[PDB]
Paper text:
Dichelobacter nodosus is a Gram negative, anaerobic rod that is the principal causative agent of ovine footrot, a debilitating disease of the hoof of ruminants. In strains that cause virulent footrot these proteases are called acidic protease isoenzymes 2 and 5 from virulent strains (AprV2 and AprV5) and basic protease from virulent strains (BprV). All of these proteases are synthesised as inactive precursors with an N-terminal pre-pro-region, a serine protease domain and a C-terminal domain of unknown function. AprV2 adopts a subtilisin-like fold consisting of a curved six-stranded parallel beta sheet sandwiched between two and five alpha helices.
C141S is a substitution derivative of AprV2 in which one disulphide bond has been removed. Although this AprV2.C141S derivative was still active against small peptide substrates, we noted that the ability of this enzyme to degrade fibronectin, insoluble elastin and proteins from sheep hoof was reduced. Finally, the ability of AprV2.C141S to degrade sheep hoof material was significantly reduced compared to AprV2 and AprB2. The structure of AprV2.C141S was very similar to that of AprV2, overlaying with an RMSD of 0.21 Å for 339 Cα. The average B factors for the I2 loops in AprV2 and AprV2.C141S were 14.6 Å2 and 28.4 Å2, respectively, indicating that the I2 loop is more mobile in the substituted protease. Steady state fluorescence quenching data showed that the wild-type protease was more protected from quenching by potassium iodide than the C141S enzyme, confirming that the conformation of the I2 loop in AprV2.C141S is different to that in the wild type.
Numbering used by the authors: 2 to 340
Write the structure that this text describes.
Amino acid sequence: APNDQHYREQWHYFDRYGVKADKVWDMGFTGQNVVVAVVDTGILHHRDLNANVLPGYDFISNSQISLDGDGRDADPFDEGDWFDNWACGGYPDPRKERSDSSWHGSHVAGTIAAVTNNRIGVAGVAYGAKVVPVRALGRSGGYDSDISDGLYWAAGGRIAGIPENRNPAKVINMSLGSDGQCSYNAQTMIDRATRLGALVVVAAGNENQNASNTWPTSCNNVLSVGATTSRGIRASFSNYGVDVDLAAPGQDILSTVDSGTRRPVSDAYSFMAGTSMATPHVSGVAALVISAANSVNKNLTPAELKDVLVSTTSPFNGRLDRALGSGIVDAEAAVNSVL
Ligand SMILES: [Ca+2]
Ligand SMILES: [Ca+2]
Ligand SMILES: [Ca+2]
């Protein structure tokens, strides 16, 4: 077991309806030599992340989304996607007036590979793995073509006027999405990323609607992730349906953020809910599964990896409100299967 101060609060790693990450660390697999790309709001300079973060890239083209004064650049720092006075919003809706910065991509990155065994803060599912921040979201979200470009690069794809990725990822985490069917361009980048060897792991979404009505779930060649609670049932906001492949803890998830309401001020930790929190659990387990597959000289295709994760899930608590894949992702059964 990890020595980090607040690991006990991370029920989602160890408890009844957790991901049994502890049972894999017991075997010596922590995702060593695995790289996971996080296509999200970018990364904080956080004492509980720094050492597990690789060079990334900022794909945000609009400088009024990026909030760092230019388009695409080599620094994936999360400037903070805060906004005032309906700057992203449907005025006059009071619920759309203002958001503090989410630190979303850092909360996601922490779930995968927070610095673990360094006493401070929290653990990550795959703390021996490293994270490549692919910043594609900022104030208001992000363009789909920035997201698509970002995910292709994340897998080792070359992009015009961007230096080659030295750290191509075996797993690409997309804690994001919106309404509408998968675009041609998105589907194409996903297929190309997959042909490079990457597993694309995506959030089902948070609108209590059929995930098929959204992307990236409606795309081929993704692993779509629903959200469960500490009681092993569907979190009420989680999207659902036949295209949800499996589920993972998506409520009361503790990870790494900043205290700043606008720009980074100091390292913090908070709880979040969302299929966005569930996804990095599956991406971390994916990395665990790969480290174990490496150990017995076994190569796994994205298709093989997705089937290993989908077939080795633990049961839900009851038949569930809605369809939410095969079960809760289960690192113990997944790893045991490949050995
Ligand atoms: Ca920029
Ligand atoms: Ca930047
Ligand atoms: Ca820590």
